[PDB]
Amino acid sequence: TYNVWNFGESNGRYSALTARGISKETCQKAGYWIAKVDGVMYQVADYRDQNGNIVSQKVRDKDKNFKTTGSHKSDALFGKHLWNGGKKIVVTEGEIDMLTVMELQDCKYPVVSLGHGASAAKKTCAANYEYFDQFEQIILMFDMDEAGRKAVEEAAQVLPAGKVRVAVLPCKDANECHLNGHDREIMEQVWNAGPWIPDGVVSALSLRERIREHLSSSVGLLFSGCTGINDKTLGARGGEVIMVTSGSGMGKSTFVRQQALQWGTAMGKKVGLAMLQESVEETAEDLIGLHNRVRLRQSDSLKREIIENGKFDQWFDELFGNDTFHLYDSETDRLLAKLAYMRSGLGCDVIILDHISIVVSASGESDERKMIDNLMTKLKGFAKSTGVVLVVICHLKNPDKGKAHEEGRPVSITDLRGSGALRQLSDTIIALERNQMPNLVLVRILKCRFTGDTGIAGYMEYNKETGWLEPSSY
Amino acid sequence: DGVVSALSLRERIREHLSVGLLFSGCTGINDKTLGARGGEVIMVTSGSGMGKSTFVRQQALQWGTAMGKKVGLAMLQESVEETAEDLIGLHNRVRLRQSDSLKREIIENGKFDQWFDELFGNDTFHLYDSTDRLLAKLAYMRSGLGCDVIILDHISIVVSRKMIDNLMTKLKGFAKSTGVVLVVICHLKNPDKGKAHEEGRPVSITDLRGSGALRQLSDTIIALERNQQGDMPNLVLVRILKCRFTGDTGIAGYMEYNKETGWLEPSSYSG
Amino acid sequence: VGLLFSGCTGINDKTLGARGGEVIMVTSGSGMGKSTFVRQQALQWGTAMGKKVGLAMLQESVEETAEDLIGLHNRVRLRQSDSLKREIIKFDQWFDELFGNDTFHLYDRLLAKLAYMRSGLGCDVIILDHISIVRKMIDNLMTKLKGFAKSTGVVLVVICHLKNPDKGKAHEEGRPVSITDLRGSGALRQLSDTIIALERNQQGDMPNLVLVRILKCRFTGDTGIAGYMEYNKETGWLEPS
Numbered sequence: 014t015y016n017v018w019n020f021g022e023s024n025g026r027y028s029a030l031t032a033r034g035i036s037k038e039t040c041q042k043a044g045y046w047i048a049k050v051d052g053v054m055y056q057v058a059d060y061r062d063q064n065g066n067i068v069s070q071k072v073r074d075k076d077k078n079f080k081t082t083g084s085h086k087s088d089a090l091f092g093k094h095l096w097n098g099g100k101k102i103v104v105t106e107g108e109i110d111m112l113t114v115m116e117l118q119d120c121k122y123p124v125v126s127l128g129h130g131a132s133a134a135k136k137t138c139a140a141n142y143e144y145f146d147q148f149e150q151i152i153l154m155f156d157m158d159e160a161g162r163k164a165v166e167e168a169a170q171v172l173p174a175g176k177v178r179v180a181v182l183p184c185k186d187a188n189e190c191h192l193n194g195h196d197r198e199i200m201e202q203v204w205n206a207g208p209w210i211p212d213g214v215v216s217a218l219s220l221r222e223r224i225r226e227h228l229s230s231s232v233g234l235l236f237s238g239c240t241g242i243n244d245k246t247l248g249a250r251g252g253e254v255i256m257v258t259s260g261s262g263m264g265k266s267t268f269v270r271q272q273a274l275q276w277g278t279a280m281g282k283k284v285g286l287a288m289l290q291e292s293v294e295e296t297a298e299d300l301i302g303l304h305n306r307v308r309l310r311q312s313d314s315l316k317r318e319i320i321e322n323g324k325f326d327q328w329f330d331e332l333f334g335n336d337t338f339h340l341y342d343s344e345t346d347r348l349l350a351k352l353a354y355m356r357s358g359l360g361c362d363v364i365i366l367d368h369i370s371i372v373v374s375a376s377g378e379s380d381e382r383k384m385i386d387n388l389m390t391k392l393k394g395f396a397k398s399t400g401v402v403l404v405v406i407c408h409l410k411n412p413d414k415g416k417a418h419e420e421g422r423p424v425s426i427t428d429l430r431g432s433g434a435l436r437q438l439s440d441t442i443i444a445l446e447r448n449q450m451p452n453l454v455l456v457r458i459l460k461c462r463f464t465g466d467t468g469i470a471g472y473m474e475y476n477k478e479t480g481w482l483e484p485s486s487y
Numbered sequence: 488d489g490v491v492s493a494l495s496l497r498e499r500i501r502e503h504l505s506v507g508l509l510f511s512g513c514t515g516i517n518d519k520t521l522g523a524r525g526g527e528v529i530m531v532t533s534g535s536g537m538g539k540s541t542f543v544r545q546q547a548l549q550w551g552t553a554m555g556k557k558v559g560l561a562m563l564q565e566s567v568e569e570t571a572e573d574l575i576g577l578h579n580r581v582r583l584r585q586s587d588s589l590k591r592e593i594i595e596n597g598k599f600d601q602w603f604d605e606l607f608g609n610d611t612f613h614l615y616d617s618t619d620r621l622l623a624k625l626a627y628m629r630s631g632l633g634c635d636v637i638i639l640d641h642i643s644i645v646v647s648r649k650m651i652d653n654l655m656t657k658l659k660g661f662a663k664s665t666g667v668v669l670v671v672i673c674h675l676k677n678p679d680k681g682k683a684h685e686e687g688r689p690v691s692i693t694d695l696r697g698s699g700a701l702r703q704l705s706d707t708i709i710a711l712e713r714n715q716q717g718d719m720p721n722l723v724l725v726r727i728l729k730c731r732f733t734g735d736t737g738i739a740g741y742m743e744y745n746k747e748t749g750w751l752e753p754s755s756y757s758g
Numbered sequence: 759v760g761l762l763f764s765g766c767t768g769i770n771d772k773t774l775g776a777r778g779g780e781v782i783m784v785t786s787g788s789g790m791g792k793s794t795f796v797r798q799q800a801l802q803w804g805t806a807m808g809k810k811v812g813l814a815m816l817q818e819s820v821e822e823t824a825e826d827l828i829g830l831h832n833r834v835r836l837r838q839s840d841s842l843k844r845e846i847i848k849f850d851q852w853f854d855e856l857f858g859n860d861t862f863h864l865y866d867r868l869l870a871k872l873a874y875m876r877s878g879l880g881c882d883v884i885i886l887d888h889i890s891i892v893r894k895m896i897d898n899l900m901t902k903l904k905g906f907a908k909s910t911g912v913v914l915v916v917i918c919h920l921k922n923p924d925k926g927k928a929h930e931e932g933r934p935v936s937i938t939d940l941r942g943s944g945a946l947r948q949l950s951d952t953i954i955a956l957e958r959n960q961q962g963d964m965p966n967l968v969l970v971r972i973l974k975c976r977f978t979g980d981t982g983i984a985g986y987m988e989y990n991k992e993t994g995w996l997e998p999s
């Protein structure tokens with residue numbers, strides 16, 4: 014705080030470092046020494062300019078604190094003044110790493126250190142562009158941490174290209190490789206380092222193993238109720254978005270719960286339901302009677318009879334014997350956190366997002382379209398990063414003229430309600446239509462990205478006594 | 488001052504003029520707009536699921552092998568393994584992704600490595616893995632790789648009105664300074680009256696999402712249309728919408744899809 | 759009367775040509791031919807008029823806008839014929855025929871360059887090719903250019919664009935460009951002196967018949983349909999019919 018501390022007025026001494034692994038000759042060469050002020054021994058490093066004049070002290074205690082004695086610039090490097098050229102420099106992260114590298118080479122290669130570290134490296138590298146122009150190769154030697162990789166990624170932009178090489182280490186940095194006897198690896202990473210490879214670009218030649226293992230694993234997961242759906246779309250796949258549409262009360266949820274039953278029972282996949290039309294008391298209740306080929310909630314006489322005889326526990330045990338059903342009950346930020354907890358932690362493979370029109374209309378926004386677009390692209394980014402089968406349910410809008418959508422109207426692809434990016438970022442669109450013959454439902458495949466065949470996929474019938482979607486003939 | 492006289496400019500004009508890249512399939516394009524040139528930003532437009540990626544992938548495949556120029560992709564929409572498998576299947580005439588029993592054959596026969604080194608044997612193709620960071624990556628590809636064709640697969644997911652105008656001015660300044668051939672895919676807006684774009688509706692230049700400067704800062708716009716719920720779903724119509732260098736616009740030709748192989752090949756059709 | 763226009767000879771029949779101190783705007787859509795129409799007036803005011811012309815190609819480079827002039831003066835579509843670009847490389851005789859004088863001055867912060875072209879060079883026709891790459895920043899720029907044109911008295915021709923129509927056909931298919939269709943703000947139809955619009959049926963029977971519309975005139979005042987020009991794809995000159 015006061016001024017540059019002189020070694021005479023602070024009882025200075027140039028000695029070795031036993032617990033770090035640095036002899037006294039390298040500390041005599043650089044200028045790292047120890048003062049005795051305020052009783053406790055304080056270590057101190059010296060900053061010089063390009064000429065060689067002392068500009069700053071840096072004082073560290075026994076409990077790893079920092080203390081600048083005065084004006085701290087950004088164009089001041091720890092270890093810069095000793096060299097004024099050369100063919101190869103090694104840039105470190107901390108300050109003991111410079112002593113570590115100059116210990117093992119007997120002062121033969123120019124080694125500099127940063128004055129801020131990895132937090133403010135871009136500021137001290139942008140102002141130091143002119144010092145690195147007189148050099149021929151630059152070897153960056155940072156930590157093997159997240160902040161170290163971020164600093165070596167973001168600090169190689171302001172430097173001249175073609176000279177910046179990055180080395181890897183099995184330690185944290187150079188000092189643990191100096192302590193643990195790994196003095197044979199750090200001497201090879203200086204002379205032979207890794208060339209340019211920024212994250213984001215991938216060469217087409219060095220991709221053989223990933224393409225080899227990628228066509229080995231997924232694929233499959235057939236549908237149910239009809240054959241033409243699997244004849245045209247070839248099932249549901251990881252990383253896709255299948256969007257099922259209908260009118261009002263046309264059977265857009267019954268088909269999805271039937272597919273959830275077939276995918277949770279016949280194939281053994283963990284299924285995560287996000288039902289927002291009803292509570293969790295109902296969407297786990299109808300599956301019992303649907304597996305037992307009846308209508309459970311739609312008959313009051315059978316409810317008391319299965320309460321009395323104890324058959325309800327038998328029906329609960331024969332269905333939910335495995336942990337294959339994860340329910341959810343009802344901002345748009347925490348819902349994706351729930352889906353990430355269902356995908357990463359518990360391990361779901363089929364995630365159903367029912368009735369999306371009450372997560373874009375229940376949020377307070379002035380403009381609905383940008384919110385729908387941002388939600389859809391963030392959900393697609395989630396489904397592409399994790400790679401999970403994701404079914405999403407949305408609705409239709411009002412026609413301009415003619416019949417209504419709930420009386421046999423053939424739907425078009427522009428009838429999706431809310432925006433026009435619901436069909437641009439979805440991977441399969443299935444529409445269900447019927448006419449109130451009140452049970453003849455037809456399936457229209459509007460868009461398929463995997464195959465190409467669209468149009469009428471088939472016909473089904475809804476059973477009013479059991480609750481299944483049976484295939485018909487017509 | 489940075490003014491330029493037209494008197495002391497003789498050698499710069501003489502050294503400048505000392506056709507360009509051609510399109511594969513629908514040979515009425517390179518007769519009408521006279522092929523692709525350096526410093527161009529080409530726009531590709533169609534409806535939802537009409538074959539924009541399918542059309543641009545064949546152009547990448549035919550500019551990566553028969554011309555010998557470096558090709559840089561940017562698949563912002565999907566993973567690089569999918570587009571790599573699609574390129575490998577498309578060059579060897581055999582539809583690979585949409586066949587399950589054929590993918591497991593070539594990994595155990597050992598001829599997959601015979602397919603891999605035939606087309607990726609050179610350092611031609613360079614893939615990208617998913618605002619200013621993407622521009623920095625593309626500028627790094629152009630500087631330290633020297634690629635001639637750069638493909639941007641989906642511009643709608645880049646937007647996370649003036650934010651699109653600034654991006655388009657920045658891409659135009661990049662393609663003007665570096666002189667790289669840039670291909671950009673963009674989408675159409677929701678029609679408010681009549682049929683949809685997927686049932687053969689003539690696409691105008693008005694239908695562009697986001698802003699209105701997508702047609703004021705680009706050099707050429709190619710639209711593709713095809714009747715989806717119709718009699719045949721593969722006969723496409725190609726429409727040139729704007730060309731600064733030639734000017735002649737309109738209907739170019741017709742192509743079919745060839746469901747077995749996947750090559751967009753031209754065919755004959757009167758009207 | 760002042761400066762005359764070459765092609766569409768109903769303009770100087772209606773607004774009596776251009777005059778000093780004016781701000782001329784050409785408003786058309788994408789693919790209508792705004793740069794070719796202003797290029798022709800740049801060519802016809804540098805050799806037949808004898809006036810110093812200051813260009814500002816903010817949209818294109820300086821190599822294309824010079825080769826375009828060299829080709830257009832010699833009746834040859836130059837930049838699009840590959841065989842003729844290597845046949846003539848007689849090129850220096852074509853070069854010193856129109857660049858042998860000190861008439862044309864191209865351009866590769868902008869107002870300082872324009873004030874240096876007016877003061878230090880003596881240019882009387884300043885052409886600004888693209889304005890959209892530069893509500894406050896547009897109107898402030900228009901008032902600064904208006905104060906500059908009032909202080910100096912230089913003819914100024916600036917290209918701007920049209921907005922996106924919300925109902926009906928587009929501007930590229932025969933819709934008449936009204937006075938409302940201007941981007942940025944509403945001061946573009948209040949601070950200029952004349953507005954010339956070009957209309958041509960792109961997706962039509964013939965794409966090479968442009969109609970010219972006058973939208974405003976502070977001297978004569980009469981507006982409406984001017985005439986009809988053809989393009990002559992072999993040559994490239996907009997000629998009236």
Ligand SMILES: Cc1cn([C@H]2C[C@H](O)[C@@H](COP(=O)(O)OP(=O)(O)OP(=O)(O)O)O2)c(=O)[nH]c1=O
Binds near residue numbers: 263290475
């Ligand atoms: C498809 C179909 C449904 N139904 C009955 C079963 C159910 O009681 C009801 C539809 O079941 P739901 O799936 O609950 O209705 P929905 O999802 O279409 O409506 P919403 O948009 O509000 O979510 O109609 C028939 O009777 N015949 C049929 O063909």
Ligand SMILES: Cc1cn([C@H]2C[C@H](O)[C@@H](COP(=O)(O)OP(=O)(O)OP(=O)(O)O)O2)c(=O)[nH]c1=O
Binds near residue numbers: 533534
């Ligand atoms: C071009 C074409 C594609 N197809 C089908 C089969 C192809 O595997 C599939 C590929 O279409 P895509 O290229 O994936 O469609 P897209 O990229 O334009 O749409 P998006 O914005 O969602 O990315 O389309 C046909 O059936 N007939 C055709 O003529």
Ligand SMILES: Cc1cn([C@H]2C[C@H](O)[C@@H](COP(=O)(O)OP(=O)(O)OP(=O)(O)O)O2)c(=O)[nH]c1=O
Binds near residue numbers: 731
């Ligand atoms: C006027 C006219 C131009 N053309 C052609 C010649 C040129 O290739 C092109 C000229 O149009 P441009 O002058 O380039 O149009 P623009 O400047 O308004 O738009 P932008 O630069 O953003 O694209 O059109 C014709 O074919 N017939 C015509 O009548």
Ligand SMILES: [Mg+2]
Binds near residue numbers: 265266
């Ligand atoms: Mg429902």
Ligand SMILES: [Mg+2]
Binds near residue numbers: 539540564640641
């Ligand atoms: Mg695509």
Ligand SMILES: [Mg+2]
Binds near residue numbers: 793
């Ligand atoms: Mg122009």
